[PDB]
């Protein structure tokens, strides 16, 4: 037996020394040196620094530029907004609490902070999904005589919201629960504690299956299809060097999209699983931090990949940033 238990938490440390205190109550400097709390903060800062500009600028530019306000772009705005919840709901909170060494805002604090940090990152995920689906529809033209309009874009977005609530809301009302995770400065879903009174075991799977594998598959299908369609059209049109580039560059991106997606959600799935399947096993509060380190940084690199690397968007930034000109 590895950790410490309390009504609304689980501390990854052995209170045999009698030093363990509630993370809602006192600094966990036994869990980790203070300077390591400092580095945690350093990070949270970083992600705020890069993440808030990049993502906010995305909304901003979409305002200065009429050419951005198209249906195929809605989901991308969803994506930035999501990231912003991830910043203000997660990153900044955790910067504050990390600096105390414990989750100062109590359990309600843990529920909110957990809920928005979680809501935010799921919208983002399902954005990335919905996105690939639209791109597949529009390009692989799977349904004949079908044109993608504003009214689809709207559902697209709504659907990410529903999907996301379908995961962030349960823990708030009994199926799984939110608890300071890691070094106990932030509050995640419970997926490592087998807490029968809330059925963590089940939710964990439902999470794993609906909120990981589905996405994973869909995304892989839709993009495969597309790197198919475009690789084919290229062959059938060798005479064109442009169509040659397109197909080449479209591949390069879909590889990225995918690689980058595993980097984000693999760690949580990898851990959730290994934990589920090694239930008699002790997991460090730093190591418990690893999966969440990856999942949070995507609030920086998803904007970069899906927005700054998007040809349309990029221009208007360079334009906006360099003062109306260029």
């Amino acid at each position: 037996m590895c950790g410490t238990e309390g009504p609304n938490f689980y501390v990854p440390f052995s209170n045999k020394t009698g030093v363990v205190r509630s993370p809602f109550e006192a600094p966990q400097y036994y869990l980790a040196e203070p300077w390591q709390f400092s580095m945690l903060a350093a990070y949270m800062f970083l992600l705020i620094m890069l993440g808030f500009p990049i993502n906010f600028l995305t909304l901003y530019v979409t305002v200065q530029h009429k050419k951005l306000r198209t249906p195929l772009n809605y989901i991308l705005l969803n994506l930035a907004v999501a990231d912003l919840f991830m910043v203000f709901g997660g990153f900044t909170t955790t910067l504050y609490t990390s600096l105390h060494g414990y989750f100062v805002f109590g359990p309600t604090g843990c529920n909110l902070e957990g809920f928005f940090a979680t809501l935010g990152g799921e919208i983002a995920l399902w954005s990335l999904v919905v996105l690939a689906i639209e791109r597949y529809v529009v390009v692989c033209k799977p349904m004949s005589n079908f044109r993608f309009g504003e009214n689809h874009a709207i559902m697209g977005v709504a659907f990410t919201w529903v999907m996301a609530l379908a995961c962030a809301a349960p823990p708030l009302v009994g199926w799984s629960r939110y608890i300071p995770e890691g070094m106990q400065c932030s509050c995640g879903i419970d997926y490592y504690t087998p807490h029968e009174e809330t059925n963590n075991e089940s939710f964990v799977i439902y999470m794993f299956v609906v909120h990981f594998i589905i996405p994973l598959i869909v995304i892989f299908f839709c993009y495969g299809q597309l790197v198919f369609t475009v690789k084919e059209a290229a062959a059938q049109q060798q005479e064109s060097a442009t169509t040659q580039k397109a197909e080449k560059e479209v591949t390069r991106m879909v590889i990225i999209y995918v690689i980058a997606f595993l980097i984000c959600w693999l760690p949580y799935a990898g851990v959730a699983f290994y934990i589920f399947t090694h239930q008699g096993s002790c997991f460090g509060p730093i190591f418990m931090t690893i999966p969440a380190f990856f999942a949070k940084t995507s609030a920086v690199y998803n904007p970069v990949i899906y927005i700054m690397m998007n040809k349309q968007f990029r221009n208007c930034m360079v334009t906006t940033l360099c003062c109306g000109k260029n």
Binding site: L72, R135, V138, V230, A233, V250, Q312
Partner: peptide, 11 residues
């Protein structure tokens, strides 16, 4: 396809 590719920002 290059038209739709553009609308998606993929090329």
């Amino acid at each position: 396809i290059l038209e739709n590719l553009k609308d998606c920002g993929l090329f």
